[PDB]
Amino acid sequence: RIPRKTKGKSPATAEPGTSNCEHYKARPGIASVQKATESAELPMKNNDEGTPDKRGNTKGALVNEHVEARDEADDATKKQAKDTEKAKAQVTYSDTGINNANELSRSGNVDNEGGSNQKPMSTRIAEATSAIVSKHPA
Amino acid sequence: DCRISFGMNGAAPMIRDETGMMVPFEGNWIFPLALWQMNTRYFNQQFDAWIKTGELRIRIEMGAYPYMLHYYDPRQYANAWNLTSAWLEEITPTSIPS
Amino acid sequence: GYQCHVCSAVLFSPLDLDAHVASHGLHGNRHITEFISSWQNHPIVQVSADVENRKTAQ
Amino acid sequence: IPVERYNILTNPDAPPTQIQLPEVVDLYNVVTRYAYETPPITAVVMGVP
Ligand SMILES: [Zn+2]
After folding, report:
1. Residues near A84 by Cβ (< 8 Å), separated by ≥ 6?
2. For residue A110, what are the CA distances in angstroms to A46, A52, A70?
3. Which residues of A touch B52 (CB under 8 A)?
4. What is d(CA A120, CA A126) in angstroms, rounded to the nearest whole number?
5. What is the Å distance from ligand 1's center to B87 Cα?
6. Given A14, A30, A34, which is nearest C1 (Cβ)?
7. Could you tell me which residues come within 8 angstroms of residue B90 by beta carbon, excluding any fewer than 6 positions away?
8. In angstroms, what is the C-alpha Rg of chain A?
9. Which chains are within 8 Å of C by 3+ CB pairs?
């Protein structure tokens, strides 16, 4: 049966019409297009930070966004330079020429509620429960 | 616009005319050479068995070509299907043989 | 050698012919898509991602 | 034993595809089984002059 990719909740003579031989070279190169369209096929990369996890916490990195997006833009330009053979990238995403000071991406400084996730949400909820508790006497 | 509809249950496979009609693998036909070149594989598994035995007759217009001569003794048997099968096979979208 | 008439694929086994005609929906006593050109002999098929052992497949 | 859940067996006048689904669920209903075929996508690709 078909396996599961993710983890789960657990006389007749041969007719003379053909005899194959290689004759026609592919003029743009069929495998050379095949590798490039394999590379172009690649699906959409996940961006899941800033979203609630299983327990209720964000899945980010405790960075505010004005440094976070500049960081990931510089890292994208660095990966672009690694993808190219050259050392300094021609196309760049950081320090392009226009300013980007009113900018903010998604990451895990802020929760959904709007406050700072310097403490976990599960910690805050368990804290609010444990603030009021009653114990029977002796 | 030239498509090949296969035959079923013994009925004849047919071909698309430029008048939009459909016709079996019979009768005198006229091709531009470029059509044969663009589908030079897929026609070979469709036509050659009808060329060798049936009376399907094709005239392929191309204007100019280099040519090859082969001679024979008329006192004996002769057959050209090896040379013609070689030629019809070796037609390439890029090139043609003589 | 073998070949089917509904395509121009070159086949070898009679069980391979019986397997191939089921793609067109025939019957006699696997992949995700199967293409075939009309000038070259380079047919291309495609297979799912998790399955290993790619043998000229996308 | 619940007579009200087996409508087809206990009503001689019940239509076969009758359900009373929002009120009470039945058992022993009229299920319709299939047998399809999903082929892979094929294409014969011709050039053009
Ligand atoms: Zn076929």
Report:
1. A90
2. 19, 11, 17
3. 16
4. 10
5. 26
6. A14
7. A23, B96, B97
8. 28
9. A, B, D
Among candidate residues C19, C22, C26, the one with its CA nearest the CA of residue C2: C19
d(CA B26, CA B24): 6
Measured on CA atoms in the order A83, A85, A91, A97, is the torsion positive or negative?
positive
Distance of CA B90 to the CA centre of its chain: 12
Record the tokens describing residue B76, joined without a space: 């004996």
Alpha helices of B1-98 — where are they, by DSSP H? 33-38, 44-52, 81-90
Spacing, Cα C25 to ligand 1 middle (Å): 10
Q: Count other C-beta atoms under 10 Å from residue A106's C-beta.
A: 16
D45 CA: distance to closest CA in chain B (Å): 9
Residue among B95, B42, A109, A9 nearest C36 (CA): B42
Contact partners, residue B69, CB within 8 Å, separation at least 6 = none
DSSP string, C1-58: -EE-SSS--EE--HHHHHHHHHHHT------SEEEE-SSSS--EEE--SS----SS--
User: What residue type is assigned to position D34 of the chain?
Assistant: Y
- Contact C/D (≥3 CB pairs under 8 Å): yes
This entry's atomic model was obtained through: cryo-EM
- Of the candidates B15, B65, B50, B54, the residue with the CA atom closest to the CA atom of residue B35: B15
Distance CA B87, CA A15 (A): 17
Position of tokens 């226009």? A98
Rounded Cα distance between C58 and A41, Å, is: 11
Looking at the partner chain, which of A17, A24, A25 has a beta carbon nearest the beta carbon of B48?
A17
- Pairwise CA distance, residues A23 & B90, whole Å: 8
Cited resolution, angstroms: 3.4
Locate B32 and state its tokens.
């531009």
* CA A14/CA B43 separation, integer angstroms: 17
Query: What is residue B29's DSSP assignment?
Result: E
